[PDB]
């Protein structure tokens, strides 16, 4: 076979150990998930906007008493107007308070006032993968593989808890002080025991079944991993057009072309992730995540060493000191206006 006796036994024992780990991780998650206002706004000084989206913004803040820096996500309660927008914001807070994994950002406080919802998270000063990737062009295959391995382990963790992530992209991946990834932005994450139906995500990363208004499962995250690996290794994603409708037509076609510099092992992995047929997509078969972890492209990957953070990272961001923002782009700064009157009090009671 491909493995000799010793290798095959080591790999099986490894796989049993993964099961043991995930069983303990589920027990820990459920305790927190069943038992989910730990600060207030005037406890922080607002420093700089780190990113901006449709419903709000993430700001660097400094805690007045301790001087610790944090990233604060502010959502305008009124702007969270659409139905799926509301439920999504409750998913995000509940999931982030309950998970624990080395590549998932840590939530420290959450609170709300008359106008906004707030989630205060660890500040990760190395910046988004997005801007490093756009600046350099593309990552070499070993560099892309180091980041990909962390996403595979993170999805194996999330999916074992029946959580789907639903927004993988370089914009949502921060690089920490050791060069490892922190996944942020759980705004679309959801606990799903089987299928779900919301049309959501980012166009370039959507699996065909989402676009086609089919009920879908955690396999959409494995499709997205294929898009992410392609984009890291090529510098642009596989389904690339100026307008969302044209992107969707490319995704559903089931045609992908690869740069001539992609190795054959990488193309084979990507063909199996970017697979429109769900009965054939890696991560969705009898062997589950092991079809990915055991693929030839990952043959050099020490999965446990990645988890344990023992592997030397390809890139360490320059760090100028606590609260440095040099690795982030600039954004327009807007007032944090808090109304005299409570808005949407009933719709956010559980937050």
């Amino acid at each position: 076979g491909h493995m000799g006796n010793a290798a095959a036994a080591k790999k099986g024992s490894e796989q049993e150990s993964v099961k043991e780990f995930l069983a303990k991780a589920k027990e820990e998650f459920l305790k927190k998930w069943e038992s989910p206002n730990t600060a207030q706004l005037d406890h922080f000084d607002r420093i700089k906007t780190l990113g901006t989206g449709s419903f709000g913004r993430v700001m660097l803040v400094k805690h007045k008493e301790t001087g610790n820096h944090y990233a604060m996500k502010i959502l305008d309660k009124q702007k969270v107007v659409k139905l799926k927008q509301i439920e999504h914001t409750l998913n995000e807070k509940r999931i982030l308070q309950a998970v624990n994994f080395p590549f998932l950002v840590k939530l420290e406080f959450s609170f709300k006032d008359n106008s906004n919802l707030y989630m205060v998270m660890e500040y990760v000063p190395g910046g988004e993968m997005f801007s490093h990737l756009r600046r350099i062009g593309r990552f070499s295959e070993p560099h892309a593989r180091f980041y990909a391995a962390q996403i595979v382990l993170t999805f194996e963790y999330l999916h074992s808890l029946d959580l789907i992530y639903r927004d993988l992209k370089p914009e949502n991946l921060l690089i920490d002080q050791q060069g490892y990834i922190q996944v942020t932005d759980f705004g679309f994450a959801k606990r799903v025991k089987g299928r779900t139906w919301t049309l959501c995500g980012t166009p370039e990363y959507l699996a065909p079944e989402i676009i086609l208004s089919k009920g879908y499962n955690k396999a959409v995250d494995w499709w997205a991993l294929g898009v992410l690996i392609y984009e890291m290794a090529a510098g642009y994603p596989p389904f690339f057009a100026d307008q969302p409708i044209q992107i969707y037509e490319k995704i559903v076609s089931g045609k992908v072309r690869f740069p001539s510099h992609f190795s054959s092992d990488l193309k084979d992995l990507l063909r199996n992730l970017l697979q429109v047929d769900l009965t054939k997509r890696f991560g969705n078969l009898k062997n589950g995540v092991n079809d990915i972890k055991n693929h030839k492209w990952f043959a050099t990957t020490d999965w446990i060493a990645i988890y344990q953070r023992k592997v030397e990272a390809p890139f360490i961001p320059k760090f100028k000191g606590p609260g440095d923002t040099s690795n982030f782009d600039d954004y327009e700064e807007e007032e944090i206006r808090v109304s005299i009157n409570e808005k949407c009090g009933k719709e956010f009671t559980e937050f």
């Binding site: 989206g53 659409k82 997005f130 927004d167 959501c200 166009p203 370039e204 690339f240 100026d242």
Partner: peptide, 13 residues
């Protein structure tokens, strides 16, 4: 040709 800047998620589209 395709989108090179940051990409916004879609909530119900």
């Amino acid at each position: 040709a395709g989108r090179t800047g940051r990409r916004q998620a879609i909530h119900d589209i």
